[PDB]
Each structure stands twice: as C-alpha cells, then as structure tokens.
Design an enzyme around this catalytic site. Structure first.
Site, PDB file in Angstrom:
ATOM      1  N   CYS A 296      89.122  57.759  53.598  1.00 14.20           N
ATOM      2  CA  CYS A 296      88.480  56.592  53.703  1.00 14.20           C
ATOM      3  C   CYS A 296      87.238  56.237  54.751  1.00 14.20           C
ATOM      4  O   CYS A 296      87.658  56.924  55.734  1.00 14.20           O
ATOM      5  CB  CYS A 296      89.018  55.805  53.479  1.00 14.20           C
ATOM      6  SG  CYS A 296      90.550  55.345  52.386  1.00 14.20           S
TER       7      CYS A 296
ATOM      8  N   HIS B 190      88.679  47.564  52.834  1.00 15.23           N
ATOM      9  CA  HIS B 190      90.348  47.222  52.777  1.00 15.23           C
ATOM     10  C   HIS B 190      90.853  47.999  54.019  1.00 15.23           C
ATOM     11  O   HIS B 190      92.062  47.862  54.519  1.00 15.23           O
ATOM     12  CB  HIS B 190      90.998  48.206  51.743  1.00 15.23           C
ATOM     13  CG  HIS B 190      90.795  49.656  51.555  1.00 15.23           C
ATOM     14  ND1 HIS B 190      90.015  50.556  51.109  1.00 15.23           N
ATOM     15  CD2 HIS B 190      91.326  50.576  53.057  1.00 15.23           C
ATOM     16  CE1 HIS B 190      90.474  51.338  51.338  1.00 15.23           C
ATOM     17  NE2 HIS B 190      91.128  51.523  52.561  1.00 15.23           N
TER      18      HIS B 190
ATOM     19  N   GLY C 257      92.630  60.544  53.244  1.00 14.92           N
ATOM     20  CA  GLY C 257      92.944  59.858  54.307  1.00 14.92           C
ATOM     21  C   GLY C 257      91.606  60.097  54.858  1.00 14.92           C
ATOM     22  O   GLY C 257      91.971  59.466  56.373  1.00 14.92           O
TER      23      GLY C 257
END
Lengths: 300, 300
Positions: free
Chosen positions: A144, A40, A142
């Site tokens: 990831c 992503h 935050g």
C-alpha cells in the site's frame, strides 16, 4: 513476440518513503515538501472496520507520523487529508523530486507500478486499469502506498496509489487526489470487484501490433458492423465497442492500412474459430493490457 | 494471477550513455571511468559482413568515439577491446555508478533489461535466457548496448548486453566480459537460433507459485519418475529434467509440502489432459520465465 514493458522507474524510486503511525507502516510518495500516503495508515486493526478518519486525524500530533527516507527521518510539520490520502508536510524538499503531474486515468488505460516494501522499491510492472476499476496487479500485497505512473519524455504522470486488496486478490486504489477508482472504500468491509470484462480496444491495438510485426494470417474473411461485432464481443465477455473507440484506432489504421471495422471483423472470427490451436505474436491469448498509444510507442 | 516483475531500473538508468562512431550510434554502459559498448559500433555497413575488429580498432583515434551522457560529451582517452565489447576509458567517473558486479548467467535464468534508444532509457522488461541462448525480448530492436541485470538488495549484477537481432527477431548478446551467450557472432552473417525448448524448471516453479497462491486443483493424480517424466516433457518440447533441477526445487517443496516428483507428475498430466479449457494463476499458458528463485522472492 511482443513484451509488456514498464517505464523506467528511476524517477519514482527517489520519491518512495516509509510512513509509520503507531504499529502500521506503509509507503508514501515524497515530492517537493509533501508526502502522500493512504490515510488508512492512521488506523488500528479495530479502526479499520469503520474508521472515523476526520476525528482520528485531527486527534493526531505531527510527531505521531514517522516518515523515513531510507533510514533518515523527515519531520512532519503539518498533516491534512485529501479525500482518501494524507498530505504530510515535511521539513525537507525531496532533492530527487522529478518533473511530475497528477492525472486520473480511465478504465482500460495502462501504467507502470513501482511495488515497494516499507519504502524500499522491489520491482516494476506494467498493468492496466480493469474495466471493473481494479488492477490484477498481484504484487501490491503489502505495498500500500506504492504508485502507478506513466512517463512522457521527462515528465512523470502519477495516476494511481495502491490502498487495499479486495477478496479476489485484486488491488483497489486512488488517483493522487485521493479519489478511489471504482466504488471501493478504504475500510475493511464487505465489498467486492464487479464482474470484469476484456478490454476490446486494447485487444484491437494488439492485433494491429501483430500486423505491424508482419502477421496477416488472421485478417478478416468477412465484414462486420459495430452492432454485429458487439453481439459476439459480449458473448465472449469483451467490452462493447463504440465509435469513439473506433476513432482512437485511427492512427493504427493509418499506419497499417487495415480499416478499423476490418480489424473488428478479424477479432470476431478469432474469437469464434481462429484461436483454436493458433497463436498471435507467439501467444495463444489475445492480450488486452496494451493500449493503442502503447502499441504506437513500442511498435513504431 | 501472477505478474512478471522487473527490477527497479533507477540504478541502471544513470549508467546509460550514447556512443557514436562515424554514422553508427548505440548505447553504452558507463561505470566508474569506463564505458562498455558493443564493438560493432566501429563498423560501417560494409564492415559488418566480415569486420576486422582488431585492425579497425587499432586504426581508430580516441577522438573518433563520441560518448555522450545526455547531451554532455565525455572525452575518451583510451580504448581497448574485450572479447566482443569495447572498453572506452573516459575522462570522468560516473557519479551515479552504483555498486555492481558482472555475472555470466545460465540458460533458463531470468533478468531485467533496460531498453534504451541512443542512451535514452525507454522501458524495462523481465525476461529469461532461452535454452537456445537468445532472448525473445522483442524490444531490443535498435537498442544494442542495452543491458540486462539482476539486483540483490543494493548491488547491481550486470549479466547481458544486447548486440544483434537474429532472423527470427530474437535477440543475441554477451555477458559484460564480451563473451556471447550461444554460438552467435557479432557480424551480419548466416546464423540462426537453434530450436528452442520450454524451461521445465521454471514451469515447475510457477506451479509451486500457484500452490502458494492457493491453487491445488492440478495436483497429481498419479506418480511419476524422472525418466517417465522426461519422455513426456520432450514430446511437448520441454527441456529434460535432471536431479540437480530436482534439488533446486528443494526450498519450494519445503515451503509447500508438495514433493518435487509429485509436481513433475502434476506437470506431465497438465500437459497430457489438464490444460484443456483450464487456467492456472488465471492463465491458459504454463509460464516459463519465473525461476525458483523468482517465485520465492515474489511469492514469499
């Protein structure tokens, strides 16, 4: 009483990088000449609702990925997708690559997470995979790309990479082959955690730890059977027990002399009447993020 | 809800050594060309009741100290005593020495401990210095010499070294100048922890974190004063609050809009009637091992 301990993080710290595409930055894991990160990273805000990953990725140049170790750029020279991960080929093998393998863990098992910000390690915590395939986790906000792991003497077993925060604020992620734990997807969409339950095996383990510590007060006053145990468990939103769970508790039973079904009895009575105004291992809650393995490692 | 996170341990792992004298082994901390360890390493079982440290040490040769980094011997070339620590001069400067300083912490403050076995790191945990100058800790079992620390961006602030387990199983230790926290002594003698109390400032911090998280249910229904607050605190074995504590909560009050004395009111009512069947940050206990500093770092 008894503390949740994380694995020392040094081996993993030297593998954390930042990966940037466009305006999106997150953490990646650099091992040998590969960096792994959530796919992503290639998405815009608008991509994220329904991303055409294959198309998005094949349109991307190698130059479009900025990978930094600290402030040092590693040039990407190939990219491919692995399930929900990117495997970026970089031009430098990480000199800090430890001995590692990749494992898929089961719900209920524990691991350490090194929470990072844009490739900077900030802290480490111990958690468990919830039965609903999430991590309660609540730091992965935050970060990831941050990874979960276990360490077996000298070898690092990577088992999780953080991808998304769900609506409840729990964390969802993949193993290092990029396959989600649970039914979640790497998009910004309508998806929720299932109802969670208490990890019964782990609670039993912790009750053994309490015994190992010298607590015997809570030992069962009555017998139970697995069936009769599971009727109560479930009233209390505990995961049902199976014989295979009974078996896993083998070594702890051996070490303590307290038969496994006797401990199940003790838990049933702790639930129905004992944990009213009382504590175990100094705590008023029945801990469920220590496995039988963890208890043996820490209490023996 | 909210997890206790330790600092990443990598910087400290590369400083852990084993120090052996006679039959006694423990952990030491190797920084530059010094290794620091508990001076009780020089004691026999019989020395330990009433050790003549000065005499014991001055009688010892440098050769009598075996210091190993992994399996590699570092030759000691001087030894001196610093309060309750040994400073061993070794023949090699640690190439892994991070940027460090030594700080004495106050009761109530938090730090990470890298628990080691004979110089092997095994896990990391976050804890607080109890008001009674002990650590509840309960891993430091046989890992004397293990160290506590905080990390400020790139700099490691060493604040604790583990020396003894007291009768309750709590841990007692020194700062890196070798001065005990609390009234304890490095001998095997009649000494006990004082009665402990709950770290009120830290509980208030965690209540702010809960607000930062989106919890507002527990906000005060009535006003309090510091005096009237402290009458309840103490019934509940909470540490009394001072104005200077009130001040420390400044930034959190600023960030949240919830005045400090309003939060003290909320805690008083949580204690007297609110925490009956209810949870905050998913927990049924009021956490006291997060400082105001920790909450800002993690919740902002």
């Amino acid at each position: 009483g008894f503390r949740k301990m994380a694995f020392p993080s040094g081996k993993v710290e030297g593998c954390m990088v930042q990966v940037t595409c466009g305006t999106t930055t997150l953490n990646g894991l650099w091992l040998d000449d590969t960096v792994y990160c959530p796919r992503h990273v290639i998405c815009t805000a608008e991509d994220m609702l329904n991303p055409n990953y294959e198309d998005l990725l094949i349109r991307k140049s190698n130059h479009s990925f900025l990978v930094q170790a600290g402030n040092v750029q590693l040039r990407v020279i190939g990219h491919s997708m692995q399930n929900c991960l990117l495997r970026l080929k970089v031009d430098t093998s990480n000199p800090k690559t430890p001995k590692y393998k990749f494992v898929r863990i089961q719900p209920g098992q524990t691991f350490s997470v090194l929470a990072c910000y844009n490739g900077s390690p900030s802290g480490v915590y111990q958690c468990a995979m919830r039965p609903n395939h999430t991590i309660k986790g609540s730091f992965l906000n935050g970060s990831c790309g941050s990874v979960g792991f276990n360490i077996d003497y000298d070898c690092v077993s990577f088992c999780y990479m953080h991808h998304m925060e769900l609506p409840t604020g729990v964390h969802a992620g993949t193993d290092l082959e990029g396959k989600f734990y649970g039914p979640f997807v790497d998009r910004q969409t309508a998806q929720a955690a299932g109802t969670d339950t208490t990890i019964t095996l782990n609670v039993l383990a912790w009750l053994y730890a309490a015994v190992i510590n010298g607590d015997r007060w809570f030992l069962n006053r009555f017998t139970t059977t697995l069936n009769d145990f599971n009727l109560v468990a479930m009233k209390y939103n505990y995961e049902p027990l199976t014989q295979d769970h009974v078996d896993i508790l083998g070594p702890l039973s051996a070490q303590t002399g307290i038969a496994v079904l006797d401990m199940c009895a003790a838990l049933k009575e702790l639930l129905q009447n004992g944990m009213n105004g009382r504590t175990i291992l100094g705590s008023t809650i029945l801990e469920d993020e220590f496995t039988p393995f963890d208890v043996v490692r820490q209490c023996s």
